[PDB]
Amino acid sequence: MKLKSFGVFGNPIKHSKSPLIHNACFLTFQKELRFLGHYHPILLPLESHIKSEFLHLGLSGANVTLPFKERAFQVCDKIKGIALECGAVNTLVLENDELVGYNTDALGFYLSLKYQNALILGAGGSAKALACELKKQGLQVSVLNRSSRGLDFFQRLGCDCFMEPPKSAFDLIINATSASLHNELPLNKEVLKGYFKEGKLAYDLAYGFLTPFLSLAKELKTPFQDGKDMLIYQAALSFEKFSASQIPYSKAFEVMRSV
């Protein structure tokens, strides 16, 4: 049997539960796979090059997490599937000696979600995949962000874009910023309170602890959900891509969910 190398690129990366759930799958499916796969956390400098590192490390496949998903989109040799509409790549696979990118956040988020409009906080890789997905489900989408960079993408999708918080009600209030993992609110506390009091679901992408955003939803008795189901769904989808589409995602998902 041959060894194959995988990982997850990020900064920070120490929080990531992607190694745990993937490694479990690589062991569970080793015979099917006919290789011995191992998945590492990989802390990348803010100014390194995703493609060069992937190649230098000899990876067969990787995930990409904050703050690299839009950069991954720019450096792939080839993009496939819905990533072509996401402006963001979270899944890398070496295919035909080329670095190919995919996006599993869009469908992972779809699957994780059991609504007519949405407010997305955040403009980065995760927010782009989400906005693309929600617009496809027929939702109205508004995007509120700190900065005005990277908003052409949301305008062309047909979203309403803001730097000043709109005074209107949103069913879904989604925290797709990286504030939580640096552990601060994505927005002013009082503004956020008003959104929650009229909202139906507070959704934070961060997983593994109670974020300031979700603690405040909790405090107000607004229904809330963290990033765990999305993590596992996108992970499974990626694993399917890692396997060259041999292991079906639903098979990975059951192993990942239990570990």
Ligand X SMILES: NC(=O)C1=CN([C@@H]2O[C@H](COP(=O)(O)OP(=O)(O)OC[C@H]3O[C@@H](n4cnc5c(N)ncnc54)[C@H](OP(=O)(O)O)[C@@H]3O)[C@@H](O)[C@H]2O)C=CC1
Ligand Y SMILES: O=C(O)C1=C[C@@H](O)[C@@H](O)[C@H](O)C1
User: Which residues contribute to the site for ligand X (CB under 6 A)?
Assistant: 65-67, 69, 105, 122-127, 145-147, 176-181, 184, 186, 205-207, 227, 230-231
CB-wise, 95 or 160, nearer to ligand Y? 95
Task: Give the DSSP per-residue string, 26-53.
Answer: HHHTHHHHTEEEEEEEEE--TTS-HHHH
Least distance CB 149 / ligand X (angstroms) = 6
Q: What is the dihedral of CA 126, 120, 128, 210, to 10 degrees?
A: 0
Question: Which one of ligand Y, ligand X, none is in contact with 67 (Cβ closer than 5 to 8 A by kind)?
Answer: ligand X
Question: Which one of ligand X, ligand Y, none is in contact with 123 (Cβ closer than 5 to 8 A by kind)?
Answer: ligand X
Please state, in angstroms and rounded to a whole number, the distance separating the CA atoms of residues 228 and 95: 29
Please state, in angstroms and rounded to a whole number, the distance separating the CA atoms of residues 122 and 119: 10
Q: How does strand 78-79 pair with strand 91-95?
A: unpaired
Query: 125 a known binding residue?
Result: yes
Question: Which one of ligand X, ligand Y, none is in contact with 142 (Cβ closer than 5 to 8 A by kind)?
Answer: none
14 is catalytic: no
Q: How does strand 91-95 pair with strand 98-102?
A: antiparallel
Side chain identity at residue 212, one-letter code: P
Rule CB under 6 A: say whether 63 interacts with ligand Y: yes
Least distance CB 230 / ligand Y (angstroms) = 8
Q: Which residues contact 208 (CB under 8 A, 6 or more apart)?
A: 15, 17, 226, 228
Q: What part of residues 174-233 is at the interface with ligand Y (CB under 6 A)?
A: 231
- Binding-site annotation: residue ranges: 16-18, 65, 90, 105, 122-126, 178, 205, 207, 227, 234
By annotation, the residues acting in catalysis are 69
